[PDB]
Amino acid sequence: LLVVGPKFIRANQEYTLVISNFNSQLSKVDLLLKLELSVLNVTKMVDVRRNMNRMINFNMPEDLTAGNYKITIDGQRGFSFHKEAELVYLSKSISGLIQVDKPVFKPGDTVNFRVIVLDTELKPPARVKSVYVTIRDPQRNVIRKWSTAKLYAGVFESDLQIAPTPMLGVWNISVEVEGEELVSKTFEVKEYVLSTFDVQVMPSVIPLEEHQAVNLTIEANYHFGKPVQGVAKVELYLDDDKLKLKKELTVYGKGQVELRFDNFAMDADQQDVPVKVSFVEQYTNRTVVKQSQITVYRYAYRVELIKESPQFRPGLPFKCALQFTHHDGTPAKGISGKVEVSDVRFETTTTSDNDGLIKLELQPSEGTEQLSIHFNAVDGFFFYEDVNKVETVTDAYIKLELKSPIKRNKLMRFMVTCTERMTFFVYYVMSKGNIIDAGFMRPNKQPKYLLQLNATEKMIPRAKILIATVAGRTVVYDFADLDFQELRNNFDLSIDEQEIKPGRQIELSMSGRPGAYVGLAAYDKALLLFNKNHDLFWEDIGQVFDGFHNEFDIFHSLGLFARTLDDILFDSQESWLWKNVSIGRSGSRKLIEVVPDTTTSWYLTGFSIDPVYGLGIIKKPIQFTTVQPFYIVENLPYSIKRGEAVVLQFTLFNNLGAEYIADVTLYNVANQTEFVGRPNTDLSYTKSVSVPPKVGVPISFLIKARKLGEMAVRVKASIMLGHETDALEKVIRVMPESLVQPRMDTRFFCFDDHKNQTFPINLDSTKIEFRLNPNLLTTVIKNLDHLLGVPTGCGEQNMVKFVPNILVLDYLHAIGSKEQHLIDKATNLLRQGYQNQMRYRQTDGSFGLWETTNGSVFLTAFVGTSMQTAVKYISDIDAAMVEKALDWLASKQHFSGRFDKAGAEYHKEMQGGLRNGVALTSYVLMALLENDIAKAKHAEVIQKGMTYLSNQFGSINNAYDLSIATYAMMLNGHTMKEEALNKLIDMSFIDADKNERFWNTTNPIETTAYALLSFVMAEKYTDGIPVMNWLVNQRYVTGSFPSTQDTFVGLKALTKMAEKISPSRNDYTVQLKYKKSAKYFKINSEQIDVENFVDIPEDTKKLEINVGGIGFGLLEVVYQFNLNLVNFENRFQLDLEKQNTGSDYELRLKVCASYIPQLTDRRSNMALIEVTLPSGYVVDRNPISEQTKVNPIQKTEIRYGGTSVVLYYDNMGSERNCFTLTAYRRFKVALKRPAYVVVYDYYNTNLNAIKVYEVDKQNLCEICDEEDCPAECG
Ligand SMILES: *[C@@H]1O[C@H](CO)[C@@H](O[C@@H]2O[C@H](CO)[C@@H](O)[C@H](O)[C@H]2NC(C)=O)[C@H](O)[C@H]1NC(C)=O
Ligand SMILES: *[C@@H]1O[C@H](CO)[C@@H](O)[C@H](O)[C@H]1NC(C)=O
Ligand SMILES: *[C@@H]1O[C@H](CO)[C@@H](O)[C@H](O)[C@H]1NC(C)=O
Ligand SMILES: *[C@@H]1O[C@H](CO)[C@@H](O)[C@H](O)[C@H]1NC(C)=O
Ligand SMILES: *[C@@H]1O[C@H](CO)[C@@H](O)[C@H](O)[C@H]1NC(C)=O
Ligand SMILES: [Cl-]
Ligand code: NA
Ligand code: NA
């Protein structure tokens, strides 16, 4: 008995079971058929006759839910038989796929993806017109959501930009249809950091015994891509002879080495020889060890027998072929020898055809017992394999062969061939996961039988056919696709049969259905190497084209289950060609594209979906390699300093078939570069070196930098009189001795009626520039992504990537600007900033100072409300997430209305509880009040809070606290607001000479800014002008303020004030008059913001600015001080000591820092340490060791190409916070200027210390190679 039914069930689909009775003992068999959280109880008493099928239908109930289903076939009466099967329930009529242009991404990287949705017929579902897509980071924060992602030919495409410092780990793309997940897919975001490098060892040519040697390519590369310089020790072990061959060589990224054997004579035709390669990186001495077995072969080819079937049939033809291949897998053509099969007196002396085959058609007579297939070549090579005759018990097969085309409403003709003379065999036909048709066929004791079937409508456009018989006591089968060619999407893609060359172009030719969508994608096997463990897309889409994925079960894949008698067995860089295109009118489209300039192997893929004909795929992915004939690779330090002698090291690579002299030319761009030993007027320096094939060859230039700023490193290389070239345009940052702290003096004017005014300015080597700006946000908008000259790696500081964008948009909307480029810029960075800020969200829904830590009341109020506000401008903000944060915040409020700090105290004046919590309480209320939605949904917190302030008001004596309380009261319309502001005013200071008013607290920018906001609420515009005069003049060179909260409150205050006092239109002339000459500026456009009017005064003493007209403007002077680098401390003690490493290339620097407590002030605010390195040094993977545990480093930030390390602390007291930093000398630099370490209080940078340190001095005479060693040496 053979029972076959589908394994999958659906709501309405008729479920057809088939029972085939081939038992010749009885003449009928009686069966019971159960079919069952049991939401089904359908039974069927049923009768199957001898030598016949019986097809039993089952109407599925429309109201099926997910559950556990079974089907049970029981043999009633005198026939024992119990079989059972699990039926998997399907809720969907559709399936989904996600394609992603890469498996792994880096930080500043765009993810591109497509969502493909197809119905049972593999076409776009007509019912489904849009899907619900959501992407979330490794901690499940929603980062982008498409609620109605429209399909086009079943496909939805889009992208996500990963942030500059994003959340690392596994992201999840998730697709939903009608609130039910259809498909999800992960991708990874990793950091290249992994300064560890990979080593590879492979033979450069297939080793043959006659060579008496092995030639090896050794290759060492960092994961990002650059070559590694080191010494490779190569060992090769011959254990039969207790021998060992050694060789050492310096490898610059890639090298070759030949190892010669003495008397190598293998016993067999092959022999594995183990090899070990120890690769020691140059200065670090970081060792990586790589091993492999390397086969030596006697012959350049190998043979295997390829048979039509495993055994041959006694009296029938037997087709097979001897397949010749080289040991790299490729076909081996033209190999000659002599085949003979003596059992048949067969013989042929030929050579392997163009596919490496020698095809054979042997003819065993019925007497023939076996076929001994020998092959012998005159080189001594021989290959023998025996084929045995079919034994029914273990070897019997049945095969199916389509004999006619498969057209709709025509017959389908098949030749069923079996090894046995058949009494019966069965067929089944499936389409859309149900059995359409079946039959019990009865050959009259025949090995062949011609099966004919009418193609029905239910088989369109995709069906399959399975045949099966019983031979011996095994069920043998075979199957075939019924692809109705006239109803299918006949998609195909191809490349011209040429060598595809870097930089040149290739012509993609494709064909299919006119309307059809086409999606193309190419991946380099490199990317597919590091992660092939997870699901490959091409496997996914290929599988959906067919069936459903221990050993290959044909029934599982066909969507079925089979069962039978107990004693019966069954037999057995950037992305490229991510284009979408359409096939057009003539049924073909040619896309033409430029091959990227890189050496790699590609995997090009292409699918196609027609709205009517559905999914179409290419057989296997297209493959080809692109090989740069000649390139050059740089290895430069991130920075150097004026006057230092640096060796710029490069490495050359030649992939042609011969050794060629390369000419490398380093250019002196804009008088930036001195070539040591050559006059200052030279514009270039050319050296030459020979470059063998596939061997890295170094080349270097000794130079000094002449100008601060960015030095262009401009190189050109060529090899055969310029017939092969490569070029590089890179950057080294030339820096000053001491950390330049720029100062900006600014004066603003605001003329309503036509006014003339003259501003004198007294100045005080130090380069200086004047600037005219029509707007507070001009330079801010210009510097939106890099506003501060201070690290910002903590949760509060990171809001500089978020809040300033809001202030910009708040203002651009308030004045109704139509300068779209700006709205676009602020909007985009705001989106990037959301993603970035989520790093600091905590499990409880709050926000903390670090990626993982206790949440902060201050930061949760700051971030939560700020994000609520951001909903105006971007839609990617998770509302539920904001709700959670503000709920966490609200629960922290005391019965009295008071808020206390939570987590670390990083900002004393705000979080401190020395003055009844007035600052923090006022801030939380202020933040909520500033946003109408939050104000509404937490009215209770505001009420209790304002009551608290009302009670504490008499004791509020600190201007910082009072400025926040007052501004909250103004926002709230509290009865005490007028009284609070008056009190605040009473505490104010003035500078009468400068027409300034301000507040002298330890955070005077915040305080004065908060005060100005209240002035603005109270419409005190004239008395506010002196306040603005002061604030405007504390601005950092970018237009922000030098710190974070200073910036957020400061810019809010300045822009708010500006909105109210600024004239309707600008129309003014600024005459800048220095030394003697006079520069002129005119501003007649109000709206305009994007405006340069920079200008460089020389080493000047005084300066005169005459403004005339009407409008608003900022008159700025920027000083670039260059103070001498000198030890200094104020309220911090900082001590450095170099530790003896025993290597000139290793620097172990012990840093110890501590706050100097004084009176009530026992600990600092958040404190950073920055360590800067001497030129040419770089930090290791984890450069910090021997940390003190008392007060741990909360964050380590490595930047500027391992040149700078920033270490963050919650705060310091008089405990000695120590650590040891390890760095290696990666680049040859002489006359090195000293480096330094700084520690400072973040929110009060006046408190800081700096200590200089020097390193052992490399001498110019060691650095240079002989040619350019100057005339002061020997
Ligand atoms: C690449 O595929 C996109 C679909 O993602 C095609 O874009 C659409 O074009 C149709 C009209 O042809 C419009 O209805 C849609 O508005 C477009 N979608 C979007 C979101 O742009 C695009 O035509 C394809 N490109 C090519 C060259 O074939
Ligand atoms: C990704 O999301 C899907 C649902 O969209 C979920 O089933 C799966 O568990 C998630 N992956 C991870 C890494 O948790
Ligand atoms: C092995 O490499 C050496 C050095 O280039 C070369 O001379 C030799 O031809 C190579 N061996 C073979 C068999 O190609
Ligand atoms: C502001 O206060 C600081 C610290 O108390 C003090 O050094 C400074 O003189 C004050 N400035 C003015 C103008 O009062
Ligand atoms: C690396 O090894 C070289 C040579 O053995 C030595 O000169 C140098 O000091 C070593 N560097 C380190 C980091 O130990
Ligand atoms: Cl807090
Ligand atoms: Na001042
Ligand atoms: Na030096």
Residue numbers in the entry: 22 to 57, 64 to 576, 581 to 603, 630 to 821, 830 to 1339
Which statements did the authors publish about this structure?
The refractory allele, TEP1*R1, has been expressed in vitro and utilized in structural and functional studies. The TEP1*S1 and TEP1*R1 proteins share 93% sequence identity with the majority of amino acid differences being confined to three hypervariable loops within the TED domain. The TEP1*R1 catalytic loop contains a sequence of five residues including Lys 966 and Glu 970 (966KAGAE970). TEP1*S1 Glu 966 adopts a different conformation than Lys 966 in TEP1*R1, directed into a pocket occupied by a Cl− ion in TEP1*R1, within hydrogen bonding distance of Ser 921 Oγ and Phe 923 N (the same conformation observed for Glu 1098 in complement factor C3). In contrast Ser 921 is within hydrogen bonding distance of TEP1*R1 Tyr 971 but not TEP1*S1 Trp 971. The S1108R substitution does not cause any perturbation in the interface however, the Arg side chain adopts a conformation within hydrogen bonding distance of the carbonyl oxygen of Tyr 1307 instead of a water molecule as seen in TEP1*R1. The remaining 23 polymorphisms are generally localized in short loops between the TED α-helices and introduce no significant alteration to the structure, with the possible exception of four (F960S, E1005V, K1009V, T1012N) on the face of helix α7 and adjacent to the post-α5 turn that form a crystal contact within the TEP1*R1 structure. The half-life of TEP1*S1cut is 8.5 h, significantly shorter than the half-life of TEP1*R1cut (6.5 days), suggesting that TEP1*S1cut is more susceptible to hydrolysis of the thioester bond than TEP1*R1cut. TEP1*R1cut also forms a complex with LRIM1/APL1C that presumably contains an active thioester by a spontaneous conformational change with a half-life of 6.5 days at 20°C. Residues in the new TEP1*R1 and TEP1*S1 models are numbered according to the complete peptide chain (including signal peptide) for comparison with other reports.
Anopheles gambiae thioester-containing protein 1 (TEP1) is a complement-like protein that plays a central role in the opsonization of gram-negative bacteria in the hemolymph. TEP1 also binds to the surface of Plasmodium ookinetes that traverse the midgut epithelium following ingestion of an infectious blood meal, targeting those ookinetes for lysis and, in certain mosquito strains, melanization. TEP1 is composed of a series of eight macroglobulin (MG) domains, the β-sheet CUB domain and α-helical thioester domain (TED). The TED contains an intramolecular β-cysteinyl-γ-glutamyl thioester bond that is protected from inadvertent hydrolysis by sequestration within a protein-protein interface formed by the TED and MG8 domains.
